[PDB]
Design a protein around this ligand. Structure first.
Ligand SMILES: [N]S(=O)(=O)[C][C][C]C1234B567B89%10B5%11%12B5%13%14B%15%16%17B8%18(B961B%18%152B5%163B%11%1374)C%10%12%14%17
Ligand SMILES: [Zn+2]
Length: 258
């Protein structure tokens, strides 16, 4: 009886195995645009993905992960609110059963159809397992998806999903360029928070981009054909794999932009 996204194992149950679920810096949150203060001390985000080396795509039973070679400083996030250098390890998405839900963060209570998370770890801790034990261990870049025009840079991901339909399936996924998933603007909000899946550790600097990317109805429908279940098990469509907004508590959301 492991955690998941259902009635009997979804987010309102997670606190029983992971008591930090009711902690002081949980994610995601609602971004109240009127309350988020412009911080002129924040730097432009530096996204250096030119040498990013994707290796593989994996259906982990909750989402799909696109994994990178993080054995050197290839793909790195720095600047913005960050001190030092954060290495790209993977990205994944959260999405809904319908276009009106799917994102984890909300913007004035608006839910987007999906949310992309690019996960990076602080190189000062040496390995991601040490980094997740630190309050400044991870930086996650969050990007909203809305349904409209197709995202050409996403289609290589969409086209491999048929080969990882079920939990535990992986596929070689080399030479994927994550620059193709970024919007035009790097304007962002930032706040201190947590992983949004168990173990829910409070180790993340969140950087949420204001400008969403557009994907087509056909692209997001292919996300919704994935399965939470393993091969030869009863079909449970991989949809609504998002945690709802959590209490902001004693935190300030900062804007990089006026
Ligand atoms: N929705 S979310 O908080 O970005 C989930 C992040 C999950 C992970 B934790 B460990 B650290 B890195 B890899 B593995 B798990 B995987 B990635 B971050 C590693
Ligand atoms: Zn995520």
């Amino acid at each position: 009886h492991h955690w998941g996204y259902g009635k009997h194992n979804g987010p309102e149950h997670w606190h029983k195995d992971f008591p930090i679920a009711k902690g002081e810096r949980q994610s995601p949150v609602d971004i109240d645009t009127h309350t988020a203060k412009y911080d002129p001390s924040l730097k432009p985000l530096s996204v250096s993905y030119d040498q990013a080396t994707s290796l593989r795509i994996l259906n982990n039973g909750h989402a799909f992960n696109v994994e990178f070679d993080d054995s050197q400083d290839k793909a790195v996030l720095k600047g913005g609110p960050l001190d030092g250098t954060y290495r790209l390890i993977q990205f994944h998405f959260h999405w809904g059963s319908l276009d009106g839900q799917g994102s984890e963060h909300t913007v004035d209570k608006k839910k987007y159809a999906a949310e992309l998370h690019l996960v990076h770890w602080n190189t000062k801790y040496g390995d991601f397992g040490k980094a997740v034990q630190q309050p400044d261990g991870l930086a996650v870049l969050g990007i909203f998806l809305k349904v409209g025009s197709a995202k050409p840079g996403l289609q290589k991901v969409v086209d491999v999903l048929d080969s990882i339909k079920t939990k535990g399936k992986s596929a070689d996924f080399t030479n994927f360029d994550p620059r193709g998933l970024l919007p035009e603007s790097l304007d962002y909000w930032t706040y201190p928070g947590s992983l949004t899946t168990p173990p829910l550790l409070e180790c993340v600097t969140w950087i949420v981009l204001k400008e969403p990317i557009s994907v087509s109805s056909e692209q997001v429908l292919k996300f919704r054909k994935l399965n939470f279940n393993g091969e030869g098990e009863p079909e449970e469509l991989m949809v609504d794999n998002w945690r709802p907004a959590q209490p902001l508590k004693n935190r300030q959301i900062k804007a990089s932009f006026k």
